Structure 1
Amino acid sequence: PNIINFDTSLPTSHTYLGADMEEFHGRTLHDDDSCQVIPVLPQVMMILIPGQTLPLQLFHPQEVSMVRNLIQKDRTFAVLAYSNVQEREAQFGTTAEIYAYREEQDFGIEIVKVKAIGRQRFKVLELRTQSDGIQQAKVQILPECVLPSTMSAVQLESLNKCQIFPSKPSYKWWQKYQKRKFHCANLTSWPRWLYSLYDAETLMDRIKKQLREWDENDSLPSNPIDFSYRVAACLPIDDVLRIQLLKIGSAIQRLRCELDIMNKCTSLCCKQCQETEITTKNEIFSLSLCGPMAAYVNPHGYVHETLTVYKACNLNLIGRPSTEHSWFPGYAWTVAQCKICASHIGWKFTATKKDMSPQKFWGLTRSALLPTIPD
């Protein structure tokens, strides 16, 4: 399979939203381990990851007035990772900062279209709801654990000059990298190969090997913090596994967990059925620059984290293909339900031009899928 006649930068632009929006570039970050009070959007159910974009459409006057006054301040709201969605129970969350905004007042109907981005993880202290229905959370800022090298303590001063290794053009290169980077492992109780399992650079390379299978077309971050978050936003896992990935403080533990999920979880089944295989990791492909899965908003303000796959099975197609509000310009969508339990699993996308490639793909919503370890 190959991507021909499709601009992979289009889905990342969120063109279905409308005309060019006012942009904001002034970032705002809070001191690590501080208690701030941030407003919560009521209808938002999604679990946000730092560096991830959240597209929104707000029609309610309490939602609209909230964002209107939010733009005049730090442009930041709280996105809660609800453990219990029906009981509104949430223990953690991510701050989302608005970077693009557009207000519509045509026909006297007020609509607010925003593009926000995940910034900081936090722990919930209390959730008090205000008169306008809008909640305000008491939030304790979770910190990002930056860790030095495992050898940064034991490494002898004489073997310090061997820390920087020459350019990487290759198993022989990685064999040499391990022996030089972890040379002072002999001063401790563990082997160099053990230290490799906690080395951010090696772990990122192992993940890059499987991320290259999904996107066969080097546009990933260098910082292990930013890389682990980019990988987390792509992994189509259950809400419980996502809240655990979001709980992790270190990039190394995050990268390790992501590798475990990528090796172990290779099958995607219907969450309601658990008796219907929708697709496998072999079909996952990145039709966007962000990866094989991104959040998009529907015409009613409902956010769907859509995973793009080449082939999907055991799905029934209901309705006729429509290009209205299409998240992949040039494709038409058709609702696809599980053939067993009729659950809305996602949509089949169909090219409108014969010169396009792929001619057909599937966008599956994360909330409808469940990763299963096959045996």
Structure 2
Amino acid sequence: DTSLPTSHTYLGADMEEFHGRTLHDDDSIQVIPVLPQVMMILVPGQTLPLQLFHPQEVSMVRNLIQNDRTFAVLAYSNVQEREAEFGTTAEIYAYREEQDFGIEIVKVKAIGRQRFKVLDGIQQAKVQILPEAETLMDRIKKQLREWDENLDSLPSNPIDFSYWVAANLPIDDSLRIQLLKIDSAIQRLRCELDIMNKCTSLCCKQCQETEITTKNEIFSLSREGPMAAYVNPHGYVHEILTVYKACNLNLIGRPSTEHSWFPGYAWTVAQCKICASHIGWKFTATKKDMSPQKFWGLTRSALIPT
């Protein structure tokens, strides 16, 4: 099944689901707290799960559930210098309250809503909400067919499809930001097709020499998409692109299934042979009656396109 990765079941069903809808207006200037450790570009309709281990973060996120459940996800240009000029609001839609070592913990799931331009050290961003072609759709929903025949799994609005594509393409974060800056769906669908056009193989960040896999190997195991944010037990948020065949990847260890992001499967660290840096995880179903038996979930972070 493909709902289950989207469920972040590894975290826990726990308690608390918020079916409210909180949506601002066009050219509206808001004030939205920034969560200090999130460094991931987010996109309307893109899910984000978090484990907040730190008391101040665990206070703001608690006082959010009381207010609008909505915070700001910055689209950092430099990141090492909190440089950003766009972002997307996040609205919390699940929740949890744990305790481990007398540390109060908080597990949340959020979802992108609205983009915006960027106008007690919590840090609060004043933002201008930004405002919201079947031809191009076809020509994308096709060349997606030629990458994973599986691609029912795709949205129908020109405005939602364009974000699906923005979240699921293996592109430079530079390109992700370019796509968020676009103020039109048609225009956003036209940059996408021109990006899938000039795509190629993905070399590892560190040596920039060994191809590790290609666009053609990509395949979806989740309804939300081949690409997805999953969080480890640390609290670190990983961006995981699933594929069928990755070349030049040794394996370290012996399979495990604690905290597996995909129910039913087991993971094992993989390692670039060229510089030995950890590239992601190879997977292996826990039962001989599941398909595909073995796939890879690589990290975006480790992969520099050719």
Kept after mapping to 2: 8 A contact 1:214/1:286 = no
State the Cα deviation string for residues 329-361 of structure 1 (Å, max 9, x = none).
Answer: 111111112211222221111122122211111
Aligned counterparts of 1:106 and 1:340: Cα–Cα separation in 2: 39
Kept after mapping to 1: 8 A contact 2:281/2:297 = yes
Aligned partner of 1:265 in structure 2 is 199
State the Cα deviation string for residues 83-135 of structure 1 (Å, max 9, x = none).
Answer: 111112111111000011111135533111111000111111xxxxxxx4422
Q: Secondary structure at the match of 1:11?
A: helix
Alpha-carbon distance, 1:139 to partner: 1.2
Kept after mapping to 2: 8 A contact 1:238/1:367 = no
Alpha-carbon distance, 1:266 to partner: 2.7
Kept after mapping to 1: 8 A contact 2:241/2:300 = yes
Aligned counterparts of 2:18 and 2:221: Cα–Cα separation in 1: 27
Q: Secondary structure at the match of 1:84?
A: coil
Of the three residues 277, 301, 306, the one matched with 1:367 is 301
Alpha-carbon distance, 1:214 to partner: 4.2
Kept after mapping to 2: 8 A contact 1:42/1:133 = no
Q: Secondary structure at the match of 2:266?
A: strand
Of the three residues 349, 353, 374, the one matched with 2:283 is 349
Aligned counterparts of 1:134 and 1:102: Cα–Cα separation in 2: 21
- Matched residue pairs, number? 304
State the Cα deviation string for residues 156-194 of structure 1 (Å, max 9, x = none).
Answer: xxxxxxxxxxxxxxxxxxxxxxxxxxxxxxxxxxxxxxx
Instruction: List gaps (5 residues or longer) in structure 2.
Output: none
Aligned counterparts of 2:65 and 2:271: Cα–Cα separation in 1: 39
Alpha-carbon distance, 1:215 to partner: 4.4
Kept after mapping to 2: 8 A contact 1:62/1:133 = no
Aligned counterparts of 2:299 and 2:66: Cα–Cα separation in 1: 34
Structure 2 residue 43 is the aligned partner of structure 1 residue 55: no
Deviates more, 1:346-355 or 1:44-53: 346-355
Alpha-carbon distance, 1:228 to partner: 0.3
Aligned partner of 1:100 in structure 2 is 94
Could you tell me the TM-score, scaled by structure 1's length?
A: 0.78
Aligned partner of 2:122 in structure 1 is 134
Could you tell me the TM-score, scaled by structure 2's length?
A: 0.95
Instruction: List gaps (5 residues or longer) in structure 1.
Output: 1-6, 125-131, 145-199
Deviates more, 1:67-76 or 1:104-113: 104-113
Kept after mapping to 2: 8 A contact 1:293/1:307 = yes
Aligned counterparts of 1:46 and 1:134: Cα–Cα separation in 2: 18
Aligned counterparts of 2:229 and 2:13: Cα–Cα separation in 1: 19
Aligned partner of 1:179 in structure 2 is none
State the Cα deviation string for residues 200-245 of structure 1 (Å, max 9, x = none).
Answer: 1010111111223444343322210111001111101111111111
User: RMSD of aligned C-alpha atoms?
Assistant: 1.4
Aligned partner of 1:210 in structure 2 is 143
Kept after mapping to 1: 8 A contact 2:148/2:216 = no
Identity rate, percent: 96
